Structures are given as C-alpha cells and as structure tokens.
Design a protein around this ligand. Structure first.
Ligand code: R7L
Ligand code: ZN
Length: 272
C-alpha cells in the first residue's frame, strides 16, 4: 500500500510501499505527472493539471544530451520539491531507499527518452555532493517498462565517467537492489573484457585497470574471478588473460551493438 501508479502513458504496479501523505498513500491507484512528479488523487485532477503544467522535462540542465537521450543534473537544493517527489517515486521500486526528505545535500542524474511529447523519465542515480568515503552512486533506479533495455548500463557507465574523471575509483552505496546488483556485474564483465582488448598484448595491473575504468579494485577482482580470469603473484591479485574470451566479446559487440551508450564527447561538463 500504495498499489498502482499512473505515470505518463503507463500504469505501473508498485513493488514496495513509499511514505506518501496519509490521504494519498491510502488510495488504490495514485496519479502522477510524468514531467513534474506531482501526485494527484484522481484521473480528472491529472487531466486538469496536464493542461496547466508547462513542464515537458525535469527542472534542471542537461549535463548530457545525445539524440533522444538526456541526463539532467538535478540539484537537490535548487528544485527540492521535484527531488523529494523523485525519492517518493523511487521508494515504490527500491526497497533499501531510506532518504526521501533531506534531498538538498544530493545530486540527481535523471535519464530521459525524448520525443514530441517531451523528456520522458526513464530512471535516475543519486550522488552525495561531498562524500569522503566516495560512493559514486547512493541509489539507482529504472522504471519497470525500461528495465533490461540497457538504460541501467548507461547510468552505471555515466556514474563512472563522472567519478573516474575526478581521479578516484568508486562504488555504489550497498546494499544494492538485486537488479542493480545484476546490472553492475554485467557492466564490470563487459568493461574489463572491452578494456583488456584495447590493451591487447599489453599486460596491465589490477591497479592500472582500476585507474582506466574508475571501478574500485575489489569490484575488479570479484569480476575477474567470475570471468575465470583471476590469480595470485604474492601480495598481488592478477589477471589471467583468456584472450579467446576477449576477442569473442568484441566480435559479439560489433554485431549486436549498443542501443544506449555514453559518448564522452556529448557531455556538457566533465570534472577535473
Ligand atoms: C538488470 O539489468 C540488466 C540486465 C540485463 C540486461 C540489461 O540491459 C540490456 C540490464 S540494464 O542494463 O538495462 N540495467 C537495469 N535493468 O533493470 C534495472 C533495474 C535497476 C534497479 N531497479 C530496481 C527497481 C527499479 N530499478 C537497476 C538497473 O541498472 C542499474 C537495471
Ligand atoms: Zn506537472
């Protein structure tokens, strides 16, 4: 409780209960503006709002844009209502999402699929503005209708582009959602294989690989292990180069292609 939500052209059954107002949460189906994330108690209110509401995208600037794909760097201190609203939408699918009110100390990277009707929210990741114990992601969500389409990979990749460019290796803030866990593993496997191919006949340390990727060392060894590509050199965890697996991935990659892929050249601003 809540049970179902009306988001744009979709009706979505919630997986979890999100702390909404006592009167709004009680409702069977909760109505929402796919651009402003404002919750309304009826189908009729929604339609009245969709005539008034001038929003056809999130209340922020595009840190990224390539074709129909956009990343909106939404500052929690600036458009605070929307971000608090986003956290409430988030908590309907993310079990471990604790922060819903004090959004001002955070950043929200909002992924959108763009067309004539506007900038349709696909999902998001949140990042603390100043985190010494550096977690490049606190939360990461993908609306079910978008899950497994590769949008989740895109965010993970974008979070690492941000974190790696500012010199430090990063990780998501555990415990992840099981689909978040599953998407991070898929990413690490592809990245390491693709990165080892672009070295090809060049021996690289787990430390240098972590520098090139932005993935923290522990995440690399557990992934190399799963890839049946890990070993020891005393005080040194090492890469077993199964060169047939590296060439085969690259082959399938040219074939199947990437539908959503981060172009570092399409960023408006990257750190230093
Ligand atoms: C399972 O992930 C796969 C797996 C295979 C292929 C594939 O792409 C072809 C992908 S994904 O690349 O599309 N990523 C995601 N799909 O669903 C996700 C869901 C979440 C979290 N969540 C929990 C509730 C709402 N959201 C996070 C995600 O990634 C960060 C993804
Ligand atoms: Zn609105």
């Amino acid at each position: 409780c809540p049970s179902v939500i009306e988001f744009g052209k979709y009706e979505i059954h919630t997986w979890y209960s999100s702390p909404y107002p006592q009167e709004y949460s009680r409702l069977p189906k909760l109505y929402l503006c796919e651009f402003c994330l404002k919750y309304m108690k009826s189908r009729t209110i929604l339609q009245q709002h969709m005539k008034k509401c001038g929003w056809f995208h999130p209340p922020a600037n595009e840190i990224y844009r390539k074709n129909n794909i956009s990343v909106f760097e939404v500052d929690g201190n600036v458009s605070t209502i929307y971000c608090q609203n986003l956290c409430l939408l988030a908590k309907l699918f993310l079990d471990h999402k604790t922060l819903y009110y004090d959004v001002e100390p955070f950043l929200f990277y909002v992924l959108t699929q763009n067309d004539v009707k506007g900038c349709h929210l696909v999902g998001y990741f949140s990042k603390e503005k100043h985190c010494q114990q550096k977690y490049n992601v606190s939360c990461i969500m993908i609306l079910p209708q978008y899950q497994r389409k590769g949008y989740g990979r895109f965010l993970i990749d974008f979070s690492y582009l941000l974190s790696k460019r500012e010199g430090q290796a990063g990780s998501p803030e555990k415990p992840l959602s099981d689909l978040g866990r599953l998407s991070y593993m898929a990413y690490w496997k592809s990245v390491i294989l693709e990165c080892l191919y672009h070295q090809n006949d060049k021996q690289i340390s787990i430390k240098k690989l972590s520098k090139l990727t932005g993935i923290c060392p522990q995440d690399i060894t557990s992934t190399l292990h799963h890839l049946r590509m890990l070993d020891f050199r005393s005080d040194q965890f090492v890469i077993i180069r199964r060169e047939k697996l590296i060439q085969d991935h690259m082959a399938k990659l040219q074939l199947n292609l990437r539908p959503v892929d981060v172009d570092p050249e399409c960023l408006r601003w990257t750190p230093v």
